Design a binder for this molecule. Sequence first.
Ligand SMILES: Nc1ncnc2c1ncn2[C@@H]1O[C@H](COS(=O)(=O)NC(=O)[C@@H](N)Cc2cnc[nH]2)[C@@H](O)[C@H]1O
Ligand SMILES: Nc1ncnc2c1ncn2[C@@H]1O[C@H](COS(=O)(=O)NC(=O)[C@@H](N)Cc2cnc[nH]2)[C@@H](O)[C@H]1O
Lengths: 372, 376
Amino acid sequence: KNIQAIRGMNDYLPGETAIWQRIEGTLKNVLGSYGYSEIRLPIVEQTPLFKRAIGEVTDVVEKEMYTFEDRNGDSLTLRPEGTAGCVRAGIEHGLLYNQEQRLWYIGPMFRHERPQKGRYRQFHQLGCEVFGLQGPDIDAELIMLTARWWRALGISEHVTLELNSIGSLEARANYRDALGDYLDEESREHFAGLCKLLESAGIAYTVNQRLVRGLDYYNRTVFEWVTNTVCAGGRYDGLVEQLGGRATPAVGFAMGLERLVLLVQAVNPEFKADPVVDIYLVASGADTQSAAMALAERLRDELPGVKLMTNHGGGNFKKQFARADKWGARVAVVLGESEVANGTAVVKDLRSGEQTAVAQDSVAAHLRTLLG
Amino acid sequence: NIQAIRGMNDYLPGETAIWQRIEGTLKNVLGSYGYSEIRLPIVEQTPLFKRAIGEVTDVVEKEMYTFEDRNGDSLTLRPEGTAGCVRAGIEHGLLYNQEQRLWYIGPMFRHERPQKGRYRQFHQLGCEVFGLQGPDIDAELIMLTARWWRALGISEHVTLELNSIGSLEARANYRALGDYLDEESREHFAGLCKLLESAGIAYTVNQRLVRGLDYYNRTVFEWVTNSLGSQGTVCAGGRYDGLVEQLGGRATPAVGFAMGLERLVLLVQAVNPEFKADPVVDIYLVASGADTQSAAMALAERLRDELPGVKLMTNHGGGNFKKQFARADKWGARVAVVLGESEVANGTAVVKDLRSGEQTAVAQDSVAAHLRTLLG
Ligand SMILES: Nc1ncnc2c1ncn2[C@@H]1O[C@H](COS(=O)(=O)NC(=O)[C@@H](N)Cc2cnc[nH]2)[C@@H](O)[C@H]1O
Ligand SMILES: Nc1ncnc2c1ncn2[C@@H]1O[C@H](COS(=O)(=O)NC(=O)[C@@H](N)Cc2cnc[nH]2)[C@@H](O)[C@H]1O
């Protein structure tokens, strides 16, 4: 009998997916308005990668990764994040040697934590990474980018930014005794210069020294966007080197798409996506089959952009209209034996009930006016 | 230093852009048929695959990435998408006495020998329809794929191969198959062929057509290319009327197929050697001087709102105008809005058309309309 989805791994069913589609689109759209490019990386990578780049002491590598041994005996790990993955493909394809790269990625991520409301074992991130820029200016842009999404999505009133700086090794290996006190000048310099750009931008922030990231590749800048946390990231200038490439500056962040989606469904409880169906093609009688399907393609060639589902497996009219209704069809094009003969097809506005027989070469324009 | 696991690709910026355009077209076609996207897990319990696909098949026999969870459970990186789509249709009761016209896109894993169209991590775009028995839906799926070929401009480079493998029984008593198909099966197939003709879809009935999975019945098909080595079949599928029941759900007919995206891209790129992607950058914001920073940034935030759809990258990391106009040409920007010390103070910005090279100082308010006139 029945197999169940592994615990901590979800099935975004149709209805859910429509919402995701809309949000993902807005996000991607904004990412494009800023000049960024999409990059795609593998789901699995050699375990050393997350051992090295993320650390051996991290709760992630220690007790959270999905590692297994390939048939050839190599330790493999299901990516718990993509920053490591990116740098890796970055160094390997030589796109970071004295080059600027503003990239983004979207896809699943894996970690064996325990299932919560906002925590899942296969979860999804939308992340950004930039290589080649040092100054706090670029750090500002990223935050501004996230800022624009909140606006775009309508959740600015429910997302707070929290900053912080952590200089480097010395700033810590000297701050052993016991608040970013040490932090050499260029660090309070770079953080101050970023805290300023952030103001001139009217972006409301809240510094906090008790803000730590569970990943050990961050240096200077470090932030988290929290809800009344959906996004987080920071700098990592030495990582490109610490993995075998010519050291170059870099900053990035990644957002939890399940958190973002749930938040967007909380703040705008009405947020709806387009129906999956605009036009339902009703048909009855014997041998209306090829006709209905032919009419369907025809209207498809004439109306790309409209969603038209063709009814199959018969059913009486009452049913077909119920089905058209089930999908959110705003209009139904009826093709019976008559219509077939008359070269017409009835066009019923499901909204207003009014129907009307139309010359086939005419329905396209008719529908165009109905669907407005 | 580390490298990518063999058989597992990285799609860099340039490439990524072609895939987005191709996927857009593919999704648009899917919506024009009123189908809905579903998203299922990368990992599943090993038995789901052993049971659905079959133990005598090569996938399960020698191709699955199976490993152990932190509690002993057997886990498996999905080698395909159908089992999981059915496993979820039953778990959430989406199939019981219902019609669903689904589609999914994502990675799949098969430990095969890397080659041209075969990778250990590849990507599929599949369709699965539940509740429609008759051949009419079979026909629809095929037309849909034909609409794709049309939209991508590759009809000429892709041919269709059909075949019906009758029922379990029909196959059991087969120890040429057509001679054993049941009456209902051969009738169903004829209905599909007549339907494919009535719509001019050219096909070739290949009686030695075998799918690598054990869950097919009746309809079975493939779309093969040129005759490319051993990776010429671009999209394949068939009917599986008894899989839902077998996996523990209530019996319902089902038909589907999956396309290997890497193969599609390759083909599209071969047939249309110039297929392109709009530059990643339209307007590059040059700027130089004392604190022109927080200014250029804001001007960009502003121009974004006013010019939706346009792509605007703000230059960062200083640089003299030489370096920046270069960084502009690099990203393929067609225009640049320059913001020096003057313009800031005077509330203007220079709009340098990169194609011609000429510029003109424009009041910040009117620049949005100015740009918009150049970008078409
Ligand atoms: N189990 C989970 N369920 C759901 N959502 C989760 C889960 N685990 C994490 N996330 C999301 O991941 C987001 C970012 O945090 S983070 O993953 O720890 N940081 C990173 O992944 C870094 N790679 C970000 C970065 C990129 N480049 C530089 N820095 C969190 O805010 C969560 O939303
Ligand atoms: N390792 C690879 N690298 C790259 N591309 C590959 C690779 N393995 C396969 N493909 C592609 O995936 C396609 C479909 O795979 S199949 O195994 O042939 N069919 C299935 O997977 C069924 N789930 C389809 C179906 C859906 N509903 C009913 N049937 C192949 O035709 C190839 O195009």
